[PDB]
Amino acid sequence: ALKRIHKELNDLARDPPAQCRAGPVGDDMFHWQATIMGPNDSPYQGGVFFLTIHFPTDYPFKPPKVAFTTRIYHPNINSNGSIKLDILRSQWSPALTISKVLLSICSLLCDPNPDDPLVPEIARIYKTDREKYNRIAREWTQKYAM
Amino acid sequence: ALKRIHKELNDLARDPPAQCRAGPVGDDMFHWQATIMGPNDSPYQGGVFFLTIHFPTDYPFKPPKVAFTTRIYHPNINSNGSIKLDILRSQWSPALTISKVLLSICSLLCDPNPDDPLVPEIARIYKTDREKYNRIAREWTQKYAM
Amino acid sequence: SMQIFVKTLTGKTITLEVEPSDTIENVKAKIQDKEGIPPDQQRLIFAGKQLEDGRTLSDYNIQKESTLHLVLRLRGG
Amino acid sequence: SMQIFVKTLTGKTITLEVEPSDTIENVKAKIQDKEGIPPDQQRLIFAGKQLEDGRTLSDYNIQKESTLHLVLRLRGG
Amino acid sequence: PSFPHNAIEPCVICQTRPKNGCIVHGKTGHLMACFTCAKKLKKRNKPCPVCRQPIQMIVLTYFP
Amino acid sequence: PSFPHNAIEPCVICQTRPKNGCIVHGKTGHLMACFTCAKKLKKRNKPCPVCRQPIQMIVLTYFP
Ligand SMILES: [Zn+2]
Ligand SMILES: [Zn+2]
Ligand SMILES: [Zn+2]
Ligand SMILES: [Zn+2]
């Protein structure tokens, strides 16, 4: 795992995805912090969202544990920062990297799945009143991610 | 075929084998002349043997036709210069090159098969009187290949 | 008309020859031809946005020497 | 003990680690390990002479950085 | 035509061994992991890391 | 670790197309011909040019 994690860290220094950064918290190469900047034109714009990453000992055969530390208004992310996303569970691939996972999560922000939601109340508002969804997401971005 | 034959010819020009040479007869890329030096310690020693090579149109899927021009005393090569050798027939491989075929023929000279011969009379002498076989092969080398 | 780049899942970068009017569907068909990845397993990302199959490169302001980012088909739930 | 070269069927050259006491059988087993060619389809040549399975590298005066030539198993008939 | 310049880069999983563990699925294969890591993927019930097609077989790939 | 520097060289038969036609036999494969040339060998019931094992299948091989 360690050599693969080192390789991913070097890739993030050299050529990170536009809105995404990640690196070890301190001495522990298996515990990272990440940031996603709020995508341009989304209600998350101007926001910085922190995540924790714990690599398992048999990474990359097993997925990293990824959760938001910053509160965010989204149907597939709860207030505890749990991300319900298939690539973090049964649809993980050892060819995915932290870089690709953070880019994948960033794309989930711009295009949520309200049909099979983690937070039904937020999904309901997303489907029925997009401008209300966007208003609340913008308020949460100002309140929690700035 | 033509591009593969050109590639083999360029390899022979650039990195010539010690005791084997081959190249086109004039301007027909599908008709080559080759020379093999008599292997050291064999009764062919100090001999130069001329061969003709005719590449078929579907080379290298089909083998080259290879025949001795120089007369040679051997149980698996007749006085017409026909070589009865499995890699020139059913056991041909498209991965074989003229270079590897000429090396293979050179090794057939030192390691005849008298049990399934092209020339039964020569096979009989090979099995019963090796020194007589070697004497006749040496005489043919002096007479035809020197 | 113009070249665009795709950073594939492994970080390998490939070059496509495209028209700004090309559908995302056609770009995924070209990725399948070069990489043997079925379109339904391709999620293309530009400026953090997933690229939808019936839209065009021009619809996402993808220009000469833009880089598309290929990740795996994903599903939030 | 010593390195020798094999010019394989395609003209690619590989390096073997061997002892002069190694049987030709063992050298072919090492070629199988590196290149996936079964010993019974290997014919090794060192002076226009085929190398026989039960004999050793030392029996053919094969020394440090000698080049063995690999062709396909053949039989005259 | 264009040739696989990335063929000499190491196994994307272990970042050490050569790409000699071909993942076969129907008429196609993805070669980007070593035979050791590819056998781990098959053993641990994983599909192809790159295209998610089931792993039919792992082929120890030689380049003659 | 021995990396395939020869993987970028063209098909040893046609000397034009890339080495993308893997010749599969049991748990091993020889990659030194293009898919087109390899399919010709399989179609005509020819063995592996390099090791003479029968051809189980031809795999169109990608380096993703
Ligand atoms: Zn590996
Ligand atoms: Zn695959
Ligand atoms: Zn070919
Ligand atoms: Zn083979």
Author numbering:
A (entry chain B), B (entry chain E): 2 to 147
C (entry chain C), D (entry chain F): 0 to 76
E (entry chain A), F (entry chain D): 428 to 491
Quote the passages of the study that discuss this structure, keeping the authors' original sentences.
The most prominent regulator of p53 is the Ub ligase (E3) MDM2, which binds to the transactivation domain of p53 through its N-terminal p53-binding domain, thereby inhibiting p53’s transcriptional activity. Furthermore, MDM2 catalyzes ubiquitination of p53, where monoubiquitination promotes nuclear export of p53 and polyubiquitination leads to proteasomal degradation. ATM phosphorylates MDM2 on six residues (S386, S395, S407, T419, S425, and S429) that are close to the C-terminal RING domain and far from the domains associated with p53 binding. Here, we show that S429 phosphorylation selectively enhances MDM2 homodimer E3 activity, but has no effect on MDM2-MDMX heterodimer E3 activity.
We showed that the S429E substitution enhanced the activity and UbcH5B–Ub binding affinity compared to WT, suggesting that the pS429-mediated activity enhancement is conserved. We then purified cat MDM2-422–C-pS429 using the translational insertion of O-phosphoserine system, confirmed the phosphorylation status by Western blot, and assembled the complex with UbcH5B–Ub. Diffracting crystals were obtained from crystallization conditions similar to those employed for the human MDM2R-UbcH5B–Ub complex and used to determine the structure to 1.83 Å. The asymmetric unit contains one MDM2 homodimer bound to two UbcH5B–Ub molecules arranged in configuration similar to the one in the structure of the human MDM2-UbcH5B–Ub complex (r.m.s. deviation of 1.06 Å for all Cα atoms). For both MDM2 protomers, electron density is visible for residues 428–C. Because both S429 and pS429 were evident in our protein preparation, we reasoned that the abundance of pS429 could influence its occupancy. Electron density was observed for all atoms of pS429 at a level of 1.0σ in the calculated polder map. Like in human MDM2, cat MDM2 residues 432–436 adopt a 310-helical turn and F430 and P431 are stabilized by hydrophobic interactions involving I435, P437, P445, and F490 from the second MDM2 protomer. Thus, neither the sequence discrepancies nor phosphorylation of S429 introduced structural rearrangements. In the cat MDM2 structure, the phosphate moiety of pS429 contacts Ub by forming hydrogen bonds directly with the ε-amino group of K33 and indirectly with the backbone amide of T14 via a water molecule.
